[PDB]
Amino acid sequence: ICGDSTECSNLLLQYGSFCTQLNRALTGIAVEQDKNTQEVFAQVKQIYK
Amino acid sequence: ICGDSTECSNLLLQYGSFCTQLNRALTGIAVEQDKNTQEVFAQVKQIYKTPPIKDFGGFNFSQILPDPSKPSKRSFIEDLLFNKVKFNGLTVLPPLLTDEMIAQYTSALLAGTITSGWTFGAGAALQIPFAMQMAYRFNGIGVTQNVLYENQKLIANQFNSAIGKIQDSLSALGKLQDVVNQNAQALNTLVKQLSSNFGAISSVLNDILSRLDPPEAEVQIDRLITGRLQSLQTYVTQQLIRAAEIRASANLAATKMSECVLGQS
Amino acid sequence: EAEVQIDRLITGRLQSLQTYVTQQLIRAAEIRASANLAATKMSECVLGQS
Amino acid sequence: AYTNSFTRGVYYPDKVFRSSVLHSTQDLFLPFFSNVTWFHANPVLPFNDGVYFASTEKSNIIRGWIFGTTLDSKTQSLLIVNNATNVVIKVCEFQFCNDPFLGVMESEFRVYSSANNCTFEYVSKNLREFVFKNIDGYFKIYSKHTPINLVRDLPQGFSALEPLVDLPIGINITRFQTLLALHRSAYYVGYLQPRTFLLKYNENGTITDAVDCALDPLS
Amino acid sequence: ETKCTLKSFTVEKGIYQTSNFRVQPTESIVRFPNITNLCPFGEVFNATRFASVYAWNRKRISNCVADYSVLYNSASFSTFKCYGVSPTKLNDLCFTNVYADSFVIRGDEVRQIAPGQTGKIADYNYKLPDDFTGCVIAWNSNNLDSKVGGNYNYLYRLFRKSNLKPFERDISTEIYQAGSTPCNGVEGFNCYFPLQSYGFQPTNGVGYQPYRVVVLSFELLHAPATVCGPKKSTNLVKNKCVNFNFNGLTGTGVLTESNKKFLPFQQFGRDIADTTDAVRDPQTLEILDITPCSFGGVSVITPGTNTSNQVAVLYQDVNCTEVPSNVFQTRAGCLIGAEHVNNSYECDIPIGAGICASYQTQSIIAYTMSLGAENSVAYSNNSIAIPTNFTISVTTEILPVSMTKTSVDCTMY
Amino acid sequence: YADSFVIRGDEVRQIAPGQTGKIADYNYKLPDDFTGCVIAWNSNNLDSKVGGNYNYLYRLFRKSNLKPFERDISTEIYQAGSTPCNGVEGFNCYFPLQS
Ligand SMILES: *[C@@H]1O[C@H](CO)[C@@H](O[C@@H]2O[C@H](CO)[C@@H](O)[C@H](O)[C@H]2NC(C)=O)[C@H](O)[C@H]1NC(C)=O
Ligand SMILES: *[C@@H]1O[C@H](CO)[C@@H](O[C@@H]2O[C@H](CO)[C@@H](O)[C@H](O)[C@H]2NC(C)=O)[C@H](O)[C@H]1NC(C)=O
Ligand SMILES: *[C@@H]1O[C@H](CO)[C@@H](O[C@@H]2O[C@H](CO)[C@@H](O)[C@H](O)[C@H]2NC(C)=O)[C@H](O)[C@H]1NC(C)=O
Ligand SMILES: *[C@@H]1O[C@H](CO)[C@@H](O[C@@H]2O[C@H](CO)[C@@H](O)[C@H](O)[C@H]2NC(C)=O)[C@H](O)[C@H]1NC(C)=O
Ligand SMILES: *[C@@H]1O[C@H](CO)[C@@H](O)[C@H](O)[C@H]1NC(C)=O
Ligand SMILES: *[C@@H]1O[C@H](CO)[C@@H](O)[C@H](O)[C@H]1NC(C)=O
Ligand SMILES: *[C@@H]1O[C@H](CO)[C@@H](O)[C@H](O)[C@H]1NC(C)=O
Ligand SMILES: *[C@@H]1O[C@H](CO)[C@@H](O)[C@H](O)[C@H]1NC(C)=O
Ligand SMILES: *[C@@H]1O[C@H](CO)[C@@H](O)[C@H](O)[C@H]1NC(C)=O
Ligand SMILES: *[C@@H]1O[C@H](CO)[C@@H](O)[C@H](O)[C@H]1NC(C)=O
Ligand SMILES: *[C@@H]1O[C@H](CO)[C@@H](O)[C@H](O)[C@H]1NC(C)=O
Ligand SMILES: *[C@@H]1O[C@H](CO)[C@@H](O)[C@H](O)[C@H]1NC(C)=O
Ligand SMILES: *[C@@H]1O[C@H](CO)[C@@H](O)[C@H](O)[C@H]1NC(C)=O
């Protein structure tokens, strides 16, 4: 939104926790992606040859 | 949004049906939460009871049958599980089913299984002795049924020890704590968003109103309204996305209760 | 003076259209799961014995 | 000499009760593990943004401070004094001795030589901490009196400072000093910067612990 | 109200949120700090000896609690004019400094103490700026300042080189020089002493008797604040939705005795999520909790307008003792218009916490739903049941597969 | 509708929606969603006479500000203080019209 500008950053503080919410939403779906492939591929205990 | 004030309500009346939509959205979610529970637990016609004896072929179900010396009548393991897990227009409605009722549905599902095997899930409950039902189930996995009758005591001891290990492994439930945590944390943000000006002079609808005259104050009150309506839309959209995830989980639970409790898979 | 008054309408109408489009995505994701269950029941109950 | 504070100079940011609530604030604080000057027994110091100020003794050698921009006439200044009687706040235009002090007969007060145009008056071992700040024409003073079991060295520990005074002066400040009782018959100075802290509140509502959120990655 | 909420003339069975219930508070109880430093004017308005007119006094009233009402209504003042600000609004404003000037003049010279006048007093004794802000007060004092024979101690200046700047003061006593001839400090023609004296008497007509004057001048430099009017208050209550103000804290709610202990400099307490939930009374210094006043949602239970027009009402989570027959208390709120029975049926209209309603016994009733029949399997260690017949049954299952494809044209909308 | 009157020169800025002052408070108040237009022109040569034209009055005291487009031609003695006035002038009992 601001991109290395302090004038914009202090005005962005008047909206509260919008950016904290956005980062929290985006991080939770990055964690889900590793769970997704753990649940498909790591279904075996040993590495058989 | 407004909250008591009257200069706010007439200004918010200018936005149309934005608030009617949000209340409809939240009411649909709340009606879906009772249907989730009805679909998982009310899967039984009658309320079945176990007989006063407990002659089950050496198998011991005492840690999972209901406890008669309690107001809630929960079992030992259901008691272990239950010890591990007003505002600005916000309200919490109670569920339609008490959890006494839920414990009463689960104990009847249990007594149906221990006494009739899988027959009560397809029609009327037909009693069968528990060792013979265990021998029918050994056939279902491709083992010949004298392997059960010649090893009954050992098999019953192994069941009993494995049931004993579960309480120790209990006394895990993070999947149930996450839902509670995410919901409480999303409700705390909505309340904290009320102390932000959104680019007005202040964030409290009186001090803006008792320090300016109407033409001047309406400008700031519209900024406050815009911010507070954006916060509520964010909240409701995320509750809609989070309830569809809980519904897919209750659907998996209903299929498991049908296929793993009322039959052999 | 009409720019300032037209922008107030533009902002509101854009908000309302985008709310409509979000709620349709959320309703279509639910119709999709129902149709996916219907396709499995057609395979497993109509072309087989379950 | 210079010394190291450990966790010192925490004050209640304002009224409003409060209990167990790791509450987060942005304000002017003395950063943890800071570089605090040491003075023995003194000179004109700067102010520039608030001041932490501790002191240690059983007698009373530290007898108040003097503030301002020029510490003389032609501009106004504050004066906070304590003879063996009690505190005397005062705001005039003064003429301050370049080395002002008070004696200990027990006759004293070679501090100033002028008291013109007074715009505010008022009259009426040990570790004694003070936090002085000056915002929007108000000169705020927080303080705390803890008992050491040493005589004159800066100890370690946590102790939050409670607000004392509030003066609607309007005065400009850029410099300050100290006042001592001579011989006729140890003190530190930190400075405050805009930091963000995490305060832990007790169930009675007192601050028992804190976290400086810019010290290290763990914090 | 349900028909209006749905915008229809036929409502089908269900439960509908129709409006809201919000307790109402009355009266505006005020609170503040015990009437302390209220400024002791009784020194400038109650002096034993005033000051001359050519060397007026100048008291700089400072941080205090000023009550201009005791002045305004004292009815002892013959003249009370306010210029920058009408008098009744003085006890509702705050400035940086108030100055009070005091002196004594004749009776008919009180009309030169005003912005923009001329005359021997306003020219060179005491000049008021042209954008004055304060107020001018004056009262007769014949009995105090006038003595038998003549009180020659009240002087005024009657010659000066140039009119005064506003609020300027001149106590010099140099021999005036009217004509061009230099004076050399001795009197004579065109060399006059510059001070004259009112000889006040006890038998002088009004307009020659002495009047005492006080000029209050409110100034506002650029400080952070200062003295101002005295706020009013009342007697806070308890156990009643009220509209309160605690020296700045404006709110609404029920006030209740507390049992928490602030630190002796903390005024009010806050919750997590930052809402005021306790205060301290400024006069008696006791902590009081402020719980949100009653409130919730109102729902209407109807069997359907095609069955009946009777109705029952649920007042979401609220003790059936402050709602404003059948009043019935539920874990979900207070229910009005349905009777509670002891039977148990299958659920019809869901109220909550195990309670449902139906139109059966008529009217509307309450109760606890039924989980289902009661079947008792005759289980034993050597008994079996085997079926001897069967039934062929066929049931339906309905599933949505599609919805309607719509398109919008953003620009045309 | 067309309303007509005469005011000072620097009082023309109180004839506008949402203002305050002795004119807009209690002489002539414009609603807050006004629709029309306001026109004003100097008339020194017509209305001002040598010595003083004392025929143009205005109200300077009223109990409460006017409702928009409300009009008040009464001439009751104002009562500032608490003391009743009884229709005679005096301290805190003022005639309400100035010229
Ligand atoms: C079923 O198992 C439970 C153990 O979980 C048995 O109850 C315990 O029995 C032992 C001795 O066998 C006692 O020392 C414990 O105090 C019992 N725990 C209780 C009563 O909570 C129970 O006896 C078993 N059932 C049968 C029929 O043997
Ligand atoms: C403010 O003034 C009131 C009286 O105007 C004080 O009330 C007194 O309180 C003491 C308790 O210590 C009682 O013994 C007196 O009888 C009270 N007086 C009256 C007239 O009721 C009150 O204490 C004052 N405020 C403070 C903080 O002291
Ligand atoms: C100056 O002091 C006198 C005496 O204290 C005050 O006079 C009182 O005025 C009130 C109201 O008019 C009367 O009820 C009293 O009877 C008067 N006092 C006496 C002793 O009789 C006077 O108000 C003071 N002046 C000011 C400006 O405060
Ligand atoms: C099994 O059940 C069927 C009913 O489903 C019995 O057939 C019925 O017999 C009665 C009396 O004879 C007739 O009135 C009905 O018309 C019959 N039903 C049908 C669909 O034909 C049958 O007799 C039962 N068999 C046994 C061995 O009990
Ligand atoms: C404080 O700063 C001075 C500046 O030169 C330095 O010499 C000294 O070592 C510092 N003290 C500490 C404890 O870092
Ligand atoms: C203490 O110092 C103050 C400073 O002015 C003075 O007013 C006071 O009188 C002193 N104490 C005594 C006992 O003189
Ligand atoms: C301050 O003092 C000086 C010298 O005593 C004097 O000239 C000046 O007028 C004083 N300030 C004011 C505001 O009177
Ligand atoms: C304090 O000093 C600054 C110097 O930059 C000056 O601009 C300011 O006006 C002074 N403060 C006040 C209250 O005058
Ligand atoms: C203060 O806190 C202590 C410990 O947290 C507690 O025991 C005590 O009851 C509290 N209240 C007091 C000392 O009044
Ligand atoms: C609705 O009304 C119609 C005709 O009045 C009637 O046939 C029908 O049974 C009614 N429905 C119910 C549920 O009573
Ligand atoms: C409602 O208030 C009364 C009076 O205190 C109390 O007895 C009752 O228990 C309250 N209701 C509930 C559900 O507790
Ligand atoms: C329901 O049964 C209970 C039994 O405890 C009895 O006390 C109560 O009066 C009954 N209610 C009615 C409405 O008869
Ligand atoms: C009608 O009467 C009211 C009395 O309050 C008065 O103020 C108003 O001006 C009257 N209507 C008109 C059009 O004058």
Residue numbers in the entry:
A (entry chain C): 742 to 790
B (entry chain B): 742 to 826, 854 to 939, 944 to 1037
C (entry chain A): 988 to 1037
D (entry chain B): 27 to 67, 81 to 143, 153 to 172, 187 to 247, 264 to 297
E (entry chain A): 298 to 621, 640 to 676, 690 to 741
F (entry chain C): 396 to 494
Which sentences from the paper describe this structure?
We first solved the structure of the S protein alone that was purified in different batches and exhibited two conformations: the locked conformation and the active conformation, with overall resolutions of 2.7 Å and 3.3 Å, respectively. The S protein undergoes a clockwise twist from the locked conformation to the active conformation when looked from the S protein to the viral membrane, which loosens the NTD and SD1 domain by increasing the distance between the individual domain and the central axis. The RBD adopts two distinct conformations: “up” and “down”. Only the “up” RBD exposes the receptor-binding site.
The spike (S) protein on the surface of SARS-CoV-2 exploits angiotensin-converting enzyme 2 (ACE2) as cellular receptor and mediates the fusion of the viral and the host cell membrane during infection. The activation of the S protein requires the receptor-binding domain (RBD) binding to the peptidase domain (PD) of ACE2 and the cleavage by host proteases into the N-terminal S1 subunit and the C-terminal S2 subunit. S1 consists of the N-terminal domain (NTD), the RBD, subdomain 1 and 2 (SD1 and SD2). Here we report the cryo-electron microscopy (cryo-EM) structures of trimeric extracellular domain of the S protein (hereinafter referred to as S) at multiple states and conformations, including the all RBD-locked, activated, S1/S2 trypsin-cleaved, PD of ACE2-bound, and the full-length ACE2-bound states.
